[PDB]
Structure formats: C-alpha cells, structure tokens
Amino acid sequence: VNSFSGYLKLTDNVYIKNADIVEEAKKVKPTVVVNAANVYLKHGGGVAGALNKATNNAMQVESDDYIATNGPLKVGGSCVLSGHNLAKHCLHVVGPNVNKGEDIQLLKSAYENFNQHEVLLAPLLSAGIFGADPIHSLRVCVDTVRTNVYLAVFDKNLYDKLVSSFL
Ligand SMILES: OCc1nc2ccccc2[nH]1
C-alpha cells in the first residue's frame, strides 16, 4: 500500500489521474517524480518549468551544475537529481521532441528509464509541448514500464480521452 489517491487503474502496474503533477508531488512527496526534461536540463516551461518554479529555481541551479560537469543528456536518456521540496528524487527523462524532429522510436527508450525505480509519479513523456500524440505515449508507457507508475494528466479533456480510448 502507498500514498497515491484517486487514480484509475489501467493495468497491473499503470495508474492515471487528472491532476497537475506539481500539486500531486507537493501532496504525496513521492520517492521519485519524473520531469519531462530536455537534454540541456533547461526547465523553461511545461512539466519542467512548472516543477522548477515550484522549487523556487533550485532544480535549475542543481541542473546547471550537473550539465557543467557531465554535458547534455541523450534523447531517450535520464539522470537522477534531487526532488527538492517535491519528492526524494527527480528522475529527469528526455523524451523525443517532435517539434524538433526527434525519432519517436526513442519514446520507448525514454520510458525504459522508469524500470530502474519501483514506484514513480510521472507525466506522459513527449506529450504537451514535446508534440507527440498522448494516446501513443500512454500505449508505449503501458507496453514498456513494468514498475508501478502513477501518471498525472494535467488536461481534464485529454484525461477523459485517454481513459475512454484506452485498449
Ligand atoms: O503551474 C502551471 C502548470 N503548468 C504545467 C504544465 C505541465 C504540467 C503541469 C503544469 N502546471
């Protein structure tokens, strides 16, 4: 038994809720929150800017030091950093950005990062401003992630479409 409340169960291991991933993290303080990162860990908007704003920019300060030491992530890759006031840890995962021409096949590689963590609070990778079809992202998530994932879908309209079209 864990502290996640109000989720619809899609599969043995995948759960979904209409919620802002930021308010959910503040309430639950999960072990792992996933950020929809880019390779530069430049958290300007979407999930990353909203998460970073909730940390009062501490996420960006830590991320800049990480990049200065290690260089950019790979598309499909990840790193583990602090969760600040939101979670124990933040798993920064880079899904392909369709609005930059990145191979959508890299979405499965991105979701494979989640398998290194027993339980995660996450957004749909490559959705929102990353330009992928969220229905596709949920299918890849279900078919790739074997650990327990709690998906926060910010848009109520999209949430209802994801549930009602789920196979
Ligand atoms: O704080 C406004 C907000 N923008 C968001 C974008 C993506 C996910 C959650 C968000 N919350």
From Swiss-Prot:
GN (gene name): rep
Catalytic activity: Thiol-dependent hydrolysis of ester, thioester, amide, peptide and isopeptide bonds formed by the C-terminal Gly of ubiquitin (a 76-residue protein attached to proteins as an intracellular targeting signal)
Taxonomic path: Viruses, Riboviria, Orthornavirae, Pisuviricota, Pisoniviricetes
Regulation: Inhibited in vitro by GRL-0617.
Subunit structure, as described in the record: May form homohexamers. Interacts with N protein.
Protein's name according to its UniProt entry: Papain-like protease nsp3
Compartments, as annotated in UniProt: Host endoplasmic reticulum membrane
Function summary: Responsible for the cleavages located at the N-terminus of the replicase polyprotein. Participates together with nsp4 in the assembly of virally-induced cytoplasmic double-membrane vesicles necessary for viral replication. Antagonizes innate immune induction of type I interferon by blocking the phosphorylation, dimerization and subsequent nuclear translocation of host IRF3. Also prevents host NF-kappa-B signaling. In addition, PL-PRO possesses a deubiquitinating/deISGylating activity and processes both 'Lys-48'- and 'Lys-63'-linked polyubiquitin chains from cellular substrates.
Ranges of residues in domain Macro: 1-167
Membrane topology per record: Multi-pass membrane protein
Source organism per UniProt: Severe acute respiratory syndrome coronavirus 2
Residue span relative to the full protein: 1025 to 1191 of 7096
